Amino acid sequence: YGRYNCKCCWFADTNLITCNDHYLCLRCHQTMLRNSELCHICWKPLPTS
Amino acid sequence: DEYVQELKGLIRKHIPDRCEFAHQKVTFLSQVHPSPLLTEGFKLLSSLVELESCEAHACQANTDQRFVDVILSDNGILCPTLPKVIPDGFKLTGKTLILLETFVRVNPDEFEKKWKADMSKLLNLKHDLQKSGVTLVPIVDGRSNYNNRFVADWVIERMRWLLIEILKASKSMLEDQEYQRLIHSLSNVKNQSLGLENLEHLKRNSLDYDERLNESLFIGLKGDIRESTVREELIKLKMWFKDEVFSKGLGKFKLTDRRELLESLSSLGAHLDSDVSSCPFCNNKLMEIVYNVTFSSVERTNIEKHYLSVLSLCNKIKGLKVFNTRRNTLLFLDLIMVNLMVDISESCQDAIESLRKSGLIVGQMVMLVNDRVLDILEAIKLIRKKIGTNPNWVKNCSKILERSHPEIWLQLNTLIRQPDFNSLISIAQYLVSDRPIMRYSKICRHKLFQEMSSFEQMRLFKTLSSISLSLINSMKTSFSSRLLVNEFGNVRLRECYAQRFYLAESLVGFLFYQKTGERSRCYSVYLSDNGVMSEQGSFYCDPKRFFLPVFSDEVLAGMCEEMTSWLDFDTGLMNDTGPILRLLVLAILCSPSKRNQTFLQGLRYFLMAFANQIHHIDLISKLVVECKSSSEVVVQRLAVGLFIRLLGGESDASSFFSRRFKYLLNVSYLCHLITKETPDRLTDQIKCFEKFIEPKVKFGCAVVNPSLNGKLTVDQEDIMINGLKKFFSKSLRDTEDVQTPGVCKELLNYCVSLFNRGKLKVSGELKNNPFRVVIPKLDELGNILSTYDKEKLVSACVSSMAERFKTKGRYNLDPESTDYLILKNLTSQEELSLMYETLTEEQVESFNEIKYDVQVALAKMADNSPFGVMKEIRAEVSLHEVKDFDPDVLPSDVYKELCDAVYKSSEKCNFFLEEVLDVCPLGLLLKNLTTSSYMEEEYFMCFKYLLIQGHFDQADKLDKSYFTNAALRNLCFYSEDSPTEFTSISSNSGNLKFGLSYKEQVGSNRELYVGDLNTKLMTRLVEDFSEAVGNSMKYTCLNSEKEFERAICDMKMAVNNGDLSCSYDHSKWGPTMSPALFLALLQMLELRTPVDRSKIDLDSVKSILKWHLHKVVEVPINVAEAYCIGSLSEEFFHQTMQLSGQIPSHIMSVLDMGQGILHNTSDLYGLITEQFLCYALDLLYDVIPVSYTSSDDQITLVKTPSAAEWLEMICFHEFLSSKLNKFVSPKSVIGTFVAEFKSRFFVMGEETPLLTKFVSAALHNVKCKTPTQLSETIDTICDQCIANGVSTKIVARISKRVNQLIRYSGYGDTPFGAIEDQDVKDWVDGSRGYRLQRKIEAIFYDDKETSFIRNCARKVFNDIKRGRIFEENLINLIGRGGDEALTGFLQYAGCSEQEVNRVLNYRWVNLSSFGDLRLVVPTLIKTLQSKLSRSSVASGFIGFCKSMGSKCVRDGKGGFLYIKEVYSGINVCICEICALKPKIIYCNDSLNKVSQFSKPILWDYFSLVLTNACELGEWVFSTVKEPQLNNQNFFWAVKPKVVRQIEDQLGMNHVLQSIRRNYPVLFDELKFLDVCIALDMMNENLGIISHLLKTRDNSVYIVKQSDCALAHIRQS
Ligand SMILES: [Zn+2]
Ligand SMILES: [Zn+2]
């Protein structure tokens, strides 16, 4: 993996979902599923659970 | 005495024709004695060279060599008591006199430092000679060899080849330092080697000054401190530091507290203090005029072209100056124009309403001449007054246009038709409306910009283009253009200038102004709907700063939509931040001020300081600049009112933070749309000087006038040496006095002694050892005629005219042949107006002074009532003259206006004449020339001529005969200025002068020291020494590209890996550091050479930075008289007047190193100290740092073991560096997310593409030579501009602004022209040679006529390749021309005659056929020579529509013609060939009359294809396959992938492949290279060898998925 911060929001540290090739937090995870299911940071699908 | 018998017989072959060589030889032959033979037998060699400069010019040689006061007393002239100078030749006539000096040097270095002394010693003689009433014309002679005519050039070298031995023997057989400068003067032509060993063979005396230096400048440096003692010292220092100064609250950094910044920014930006209104269109004054024009026109003709045709014939008839003045030559064709208007009312029943009120005449108006609206009743009175003055004005000047004249006209009877004054009263009564009013000096209704739909905002910028175009060609109006009627609350506007601009098919606008030229004006803007007038306002702005938006509505409406589509993640956020940003982008261009440039640049530092984790403490008291007006608030509420909107809301506004950073960074850089121009240059040099002196007198080191040669007095010495030991005080353990320049002397000792041993990451092993035209004055830099040249070309013109009418005896001067000379050597009535009007106003105001003093001097050349006391001289005129001296410099602000009318208007007397006499015999220009301004309406210049008329400016000596410093002036070739024995601080000849100038950067103006000519040759030595030492270093990146590329490649991977990476700066790195620091560093280095392991001597460098310790910074002359009139620099002047009151014109100093002199000698100093400080954190905070350097900005990347607990790491890091006068600027910002280096910002995981520096750099810098060269620069800036991925849609709208700047410019269009439209992928694959094929085959849209030339190219190129010869004799087949070479190739490849019949019928009309376009050999040779050997833009585009729409084409015969004349000779050919593409490709039979230009396009197609197959591919040939959605924001990296069918290393082979092509052009000036090098030399538009010796130079292209996958593909 890369650097230990969220790839989206830059200012979080803890409880991070190991996504495809970049971290992601539970705060900004809710604000991606309502647009679509394809991401908008790496453009490959993600796990839901 | 072994050559003494040879010497008298050697020089007997020079005949004493005159009395100047008879007296020399009889005291030469009568002295066989070597003691005067090298004084009296040696002063003859000057006396033969001095006579050459009196036979060429008009002259009488000086045989007595005597004074000037009694050379004016040989004529009967009262004594002026001049200073004592001696001329080497004069010539007097009447009351003018021609001093001519004579001096000769060989090397240039001590030539210009003789010319600058001679010209100053001559021009400090006029001011005492002016008071006697005679003016001078001074000349000098530059000679770089001996080229005498009176001998035959084969015996004078025998002098200096046989007198060079006689003085060595003469002083060996029988005064100290006056010997070898004579040798360096007498010798042969010096192909002299210049290096660091040149300093070694000097004398090196002492001064009893450098000992009190060395008591202060090398003492503490012992330079061999043991490396086991520094560690225990620094542990005590940190143990002092943390317990002492950090915990009691004096640390310099902090933790950013990320809410307190967005409490601070509101009071930073939202100026709730002042009283501006919220509505944006109200406060500004030009946004209002856009809003008033654009809602009066949106919610809502053969006689016209006849009138404009005779108008454009009047424009050609004006520029000849034939009617002996500039008044009745304008009323004359005013009469012509009003007669041609009144000969329209007798035509159709209605025409002056239905076809003229919709066009060129509004109510009570008429348009004519240069640009003047003349408005009929006033015009009617003037003609009646002129015919009242003269009974029959139009009987001879009616047709003086035949004889002594062009005698080609079309005005049938309007020349002679007397305008019936009893007829124009009806027309003057019919159209009557309110007159134009032009202003100087409550509630709102402006419809709330956010409440407009997304179509009626484009109709702001399409009024902004059309108002900006009428602003720009209000520069083109002719710069003399004096009106016919002259002369502040509100002015009703009688007559004034005018420009026009179309909006729709009935209504137009106008633009009214009074002052022509490039300064600020007082404009007014009108509409004309259907005849009705409606005033819509007034504003006050400046013309040439509006060149940014001239045609670029689609550009600046495509990027305010590109930048918005980055925010498709909060849709409600986008639909609000869209219609607030476009108000900002209007608000910048509609008010270009430096301040709302500087402020928007100041937010790329606020923005790193909020993504990072540590910001410097003082920066919020630096991002504020006070609103000097009430217009820089409405911009500073849409910028800050945007950062409050999307940096931080009170909720969790951190959804997608990366695009937020990108879109705020390209709003911080939205700064750059404003033109860097320095709005006025006398208020720029006050700021430049005030930034120069304030870090200097605060510390106390500036002095007044030094000697400029060697010595300093004692009181001047004391301030220098006290500044020296005050610079080095700064004891190590006091936290006060930390913002003070200088070094801690005990810390620098460790810093150099640890460097001696090999423990720093760099170490001094130092491979390949280092020891291997007009030029202006230095007090006014940045200008274009410095004050020395403005008299030198005067004296050249007077000497050229004084000889021309004494060869025959004309004694009359022609008022164009006296303007023919100056206007020639600065840069037949047609040739004058060809090259008069291609100046700038900065030069027109100089050309007037040159014409002025030349005609006054010519009037004085043959020359051999004051009771107008309306206003008494008693207290006015005499005082003004004395205070202002000469009449020429007299001010006009001393009196009222009407007194200039009444004192001029004395009756006719002996002062005047009549019949202004266009031949004008000499001796009358003091009375003829005044009447020409007595009849033209001007008065003031007539007042100056009337005043300058009426007398209103008023044996021991033989031991001294050896060359001593009293015996300097005996010779011209003595070379008095020669370097002979350097001293502790000087060089016995000069003292390293400079001069001041600014650089015009974006935010803050950078100063720049222009240096003299000795100073460059003494600076390049030191600079290449440091380039040699820093070549063997490992961490700088200033000159080497490779290490900079390694630093960027490290920074990418080390941001992504959890580092803590900083981004520093150094505040005033220029004017703080000093050469004495570089001395104290260069004393104790070792630098052991790898060839010979020893300690080299650096004494030739240690004894030349002492020269840079004592520089002489001038003051500019443009600031010494504006501070004299009336601000701590002003106090520095006005306390140095209460000393001895001489002006402070020189500042010897201690601490400057101006930015751009000693540049690489701080590139190492910014590296040694950085490695010391980067060792200070490997040892006291157990990490492993690494610190790069670009001499002004740094980045010290830091790894951490195993998140900002370690402020102690960083706040200590500043605290040592301030001990070495490397300060950390408050612009610095350190954290772990954003980091910068030379403005290339590296955000996490990516790079920010930074869209708005490239488009803002390509909208400007349109430099015009030819309309093919201008489609090279902007094509290249489009090639770089896709490497950061702007779009293609922004790329294809720069490439119609660049096309319509041409299609407006007279040139018309041509199939190459500007670069193409609809470009998608080919920026990745291929240079400019590829895109033209996609442009040409875009015309043939059916693709059925270039298919055959592609098939013939498939026949040819497979045959011309290797393994076969197949006509390698094509070197002569190309040179037949262009039109028939394809007629060879096609029947070579083989077809009928009918194929050539259906191919050669296509022809494109060219303009650079025989010669190329002229406006005042291919480009191949000038392209190769640069591999062989080594003003405001909006006034440099007007010269591309003023000297191009006039005569600029050339034919094969001797001659020139117009462009409209060529396009008038082409017919209409509707039969399907002209109907392919209109106005671009023609038929063959439509080119009958003009038939000598037309090449085919198809030959150019074939030559481009055989160029491209050489350069790449074997796939340019195929027919285009028709192309193949992903998200709009998925951009990714591609590589070029080119297949090149040559072999590389072409650095020399292009030179060896012109012998087979053209031998004499090479005389005077591989496997497949040769067959497509003769396909390049026959035209210009091809460009191979510029693209094969270089490479593609980006190779890392990054593009969108939606604009890299959507494209075509062309496989094989
Ligand atoms: Zn997040
Ligand atoms: Zn993703």
Side-chain angles (χ1 to χ4, degrees), chain B residues 262-315 317-342 344-401 404 406 408-441 444 446-489:
Chain B
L262 297 186
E263 197 274 329
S264 178
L265 190 57
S266 70
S267 175
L268 190 274
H271 294 84
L272 268 300
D273 186 75
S274 183
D275 54 354
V276 80
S277 296
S278 299
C279 190
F281 295 106
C282 298
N283 307 124
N284 193 358
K285 291 179 77 171
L286 205 155
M287 287 160 70
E288 185 183 3
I289 275 168
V290 165
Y291 182 77
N292 285 320
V293 168
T294 197
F295 280 104
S296 177
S297 73
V298 171
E299 68 179 3
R300 292 179 179 177
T301 64
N302 51 4
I303 56 169
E304 183 179 2
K305 67 178 72 66
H306 179 75
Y307 193 87
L308 290 181
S309 69
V310 73
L311 187 64
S312 177
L313 191 59
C314 285
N315 277 318
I317 206 166
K318 185 177 184 292
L320 282 82
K321 195 187 288 184
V322 292
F323 294 171
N324 77 25
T325 185
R326 287 182 289 113
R327 190 260 184 87
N328 62 7
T329 185
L330 190 140
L331 288 173
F332 182 79
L333 83 171
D334 185 77
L335 183 143
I336 296 172
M337 194 62 65
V338 68
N339 285 321
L340 200 138
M341 186 180 73
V342 77
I344 305 300
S345 178
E346 295 176 351
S347 177
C348 178
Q349 302 179 187
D350 274 57
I352 200 165
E353 298 90 2
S354 179
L355 291 174
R356 300 299 298 274
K357 281 183 176 289
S358 298
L360 310 177
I361 51 101
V362 309
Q364 191 178 359
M365 196 273 269
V366 52
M367 184 167 179
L368 51 58
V369 175
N370 287 148
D371 280 324
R372 298 178 293 111
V373 154
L374 197 270
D375 294 331
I376 294 169
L377 299 177
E378 290 303 13
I380 291 186
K381 165 187 173 182
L382 286 176
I383 304 299
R384 185 178 291 165
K385 176 66 179 293
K386 183 64 179 174
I387 197 170
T389 59
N390 302 249
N392 292 146
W393 177 58
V394 280
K395 65 183 185 295
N396 52 2
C397 66
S398 63
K399 195 175 286 297
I400 201 168
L401 295 178
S404 68
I408 291 96
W409 50 265
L410 295 175
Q411 284 78 243
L412 287 82
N413 55 0
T414 56
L415 291 171
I416 58 99
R417 184 173 176 180
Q418 190 65 251
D420 295 332
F421 296 158
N422 296 318
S423 64
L424 286 176
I425 303 300
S426 65
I427 298 97
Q429 193 277 128
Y430 173 68
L431 72 165
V432 171
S433 182
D434 53 352
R435 292 181 72 185
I437 188 172
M438 186 270 283
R439 283 84 178 271
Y440 294 168
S441 71
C444 63
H446 286 103
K447 288 199 287 185
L448 194 67
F449 187 81
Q450 294 88 247
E451 202 264 330
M452 284 185 281
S453 302
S454 179
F455 178 71
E456 67 269 15
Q457 287 177 354
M458 299 296 108
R459 294 290 296 166
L460 294 173
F461 300 101
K462 285 302 286 184
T463 60
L464 189 54
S465 300
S466 290
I467 185 74
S468 178
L469 186 63
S470 297
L471 259 74
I472 284 302
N473 65 354
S474 66
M475 207 81 75
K476 185 177 71 67
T477 301
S478 178
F479 291 101
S480 67
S481 179
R482 182 71 67 184
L483 289 173
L484 46 81
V485 168
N486 289 113
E487 295 184 355
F488 55 95

Side-chain angles (χ1 to χ4, degrees), chain B residues 1377-1394 1396-1407:
Chain B
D1379 200 359
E1380 72 272 16
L1382 183 62
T1383 71
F1385 272 167
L1386 190 61
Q1387 65 193 356
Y1388 173 73
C1391 187
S1392 71
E1393 58 90 19
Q1394 191 176 4
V1396 184
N1397 195 3
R1398 73 178 70 191
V1399 165
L1400 263 289
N1401 48 3
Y1402 292 110
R1403 299 290 183 90
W1404 65 279
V1405 51
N1406 194 353
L1407 276 303

Side-chain angles (χ1 to χ4, degrees), chain B residues 66 172 205 393 439 662 946 1431 1503:
Chain B
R66 60 189 176 93
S172 70
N205 56 6
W393 177 58
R439 283 84 178 271
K662 183 188 290 186
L946 287 175
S1431 67
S1503 181

Side-chain angles (χ1 to χ4, degrees), chain A residues 22 39 41-42:
Chain A
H22 52 91
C39 179
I41 298 301
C42 64

Side-chain angles (χ1 to χ4, degrees), chain A residues 6-12 16 24-29 31, chain B residues 652 654-655:
Chain A
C6 303
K7 184 65 77 68
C8 67
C9 63
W10 277 2
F11 300 118
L16 303 179
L24 202 147
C25 67
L26 291 174
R27 171 70 271 172
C28 301
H29 195 192
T31 59
Chain B
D652 188 72
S654 299
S655 298

Side-chain angles (χ1 to χ4, degrees), chain A residues 2-11 27-28 31-32 34-35 38-43, chain B residues 258 569-570 611 652 654-659 1055-1058 1233 1243-1244 1526-1527 1529-1530:
Chain A
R3 192 175 62 86
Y4 187 70
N5 292 114
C6 303
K7 184 65 77 68
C8 67
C9 63
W10 277 2
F11 300 118
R27 171 70 271 172
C28 301
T31 59
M32 193 271 281
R34 61 97 172 170
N35 285 314
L38 179 57
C39 179
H40 297 291
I41 298 301
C42 64
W43 284 269
Chain B
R258 289 181 59 189
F569 57 96
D570 284 328
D652 188 72
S654 299
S655 298
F656 287 174
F657 193 79
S658 303
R659 299 180 185 185
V1055 163
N1056 291 315
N1057 202 0
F1233 292 154
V1243 169
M1244 176 181 178
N1526 203 357
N1527 273 314
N1529 204 2
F1530 179 73

